[PDB]
Amino acid sequence: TADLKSLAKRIYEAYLKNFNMNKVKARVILSGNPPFVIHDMETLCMAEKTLVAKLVANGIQNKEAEVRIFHCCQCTSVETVTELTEFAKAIPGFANLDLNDQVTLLKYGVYEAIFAMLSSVMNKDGMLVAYGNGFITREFLKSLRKPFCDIMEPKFDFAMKFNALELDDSDISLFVAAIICCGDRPGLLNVGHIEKMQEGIVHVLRLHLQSNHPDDIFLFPKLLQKMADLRQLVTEHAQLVQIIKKTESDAALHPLLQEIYRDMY
Amino acid sequence: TADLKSLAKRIYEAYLKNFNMNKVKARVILSGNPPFVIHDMETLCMAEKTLVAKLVANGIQNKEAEVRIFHCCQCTSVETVTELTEFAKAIPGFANLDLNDQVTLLKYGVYEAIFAMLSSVMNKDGMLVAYGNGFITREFLKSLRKPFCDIMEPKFDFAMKFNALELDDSDISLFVAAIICCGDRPGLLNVGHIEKMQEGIVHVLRLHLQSNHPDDIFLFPKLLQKMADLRQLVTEHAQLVQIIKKTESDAALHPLLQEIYRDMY
Ligand SMILES: CC[C@@H](Cc1ccc(OC)c(C(=O)NCc2ccc(Oc3ccc(F)cc3)c(F)c2)c1)C(=O)O
């Protein structure tokens, strides 16, 4: 249908406009300001001086390397939450929802969306960082002392299977919209209206996948399962973040992320 | 032993990573995107339009319902063969085997592994389908016209007895590894090395069952018998598939499955 084809394009266009990184751009960079490779402590410190020089300009008062990385990961998340919040406006009916419901949907959806979209900048060897200007290796992230190493690898595990689906940005934009419009989030005021909004996006996603991936007759239920997988990934992530908060006094939580996690799971 | 305890954990972790469905996840779903129930032709057609819409988008050129189900079963098998192939890498010595021997082990092992793992998504009333998003009833599958109904019920019969053993994913991962590392498959090049690889996994499986199931002193020989039962189940399955291929011109065999069955039994 023309209105459904146009809805899929409106959401794709809103995705290309609001996210600084997309999968086409990421794949160009990942093929080879070429990305500076962070693969050990020496190169982490070099990258810091060029790409986040403010963070390491304190001398002996700088934080432990694992804590600096954790801070930079949170800063990345904060930026993606801002992009996700503006993206959400192109989802039909989202801006027509109660202001409090918009908050609840974004609260439970953003980290599912973050980990889905992280896959676009990940390969089996590492991931893009710092607006495409660095590449940090998966082995280096695994090498961080506990518990900071444990933040990283489950996200690569998710991403490698997600990337094997060979989605493109036109698919992922609709998937991220579908994540944001979940009617079963806790605390929603107008569940009925959200379910109808969800049904419309999921309807467009199913038709789009049929059209864009005729080779994979199971792709739509595969992506439904990935949404469930992402919910569990986020629950587990929040638990690990809580461990870091209680046992690592130097790893301050950004206040915006603090409020996202507050009363989440 | 720490190296044997770690081997059992390495195989369990490889199982949790490589299979989209596991028994914990399946049991959560089976307790009640909740699964759409396929219990008759009306609901089969509804599920098709939502979960495999490409297959029924041909109008009067669609296949008979039994043939569409057969195709969707083959597609499920093809996906599980892919997961099984990547799982096999965590079995110690498997990646060190001759490339041709890896092929032979997977050739004779995958359907034994498929039917063992199908049990995790089966109960006495039906089974999960389509990445956890559908539940098709055992009575509906029995209702299919011959010979397609005869594909289904022997697998439920096997599964109900297998499930009564109350294995968990830590057991099943080792059992599936033991299935893949059978040294008596036809055509093997380095039988001696495979037998030693088998002995190591079977050794770990025996110790694991002692530790995880202290209430069942016969559990290890019970599972040895289930491996033999699965071999016979596969021989019988291949015979029925051959009948369908010869007598049902609309039931095309997927080429990957065609090669698995080629010169099997
Ligand atoms: C705190 C956890 C998050 C969720 C989370 C979980 C996993 C992740 O990746 C697997 C990521 C993430 O953003 N990875 C990209 C990234 C990696 C390292 C970085 O560190 C540097 C440091 C110096 C440099 F010069 C360049 C990069 C960085 F800045 C971004 C985020 C949250 O709870 O919000």
Ligand SMILES: CC[C@@H](Cc1ccc(OC)c(C(=O)NCc2ccc(Oc3ccc(F)cc3)c(F)c2)c1)C(=O)O
């Ligand atoms: C061809 C035989 C196989 C071996 C075999 C034998 C027995 C089985 O189950 C007892 C299964 C199997 O996979 N059962 C799950 C399943 C069931 C129905 C499905 O049909 C639909 C249709 C429409 C839907 F919307 C959802 C599901 C489906 F997709 C998957 C497989 C092969 O020789 O490879």
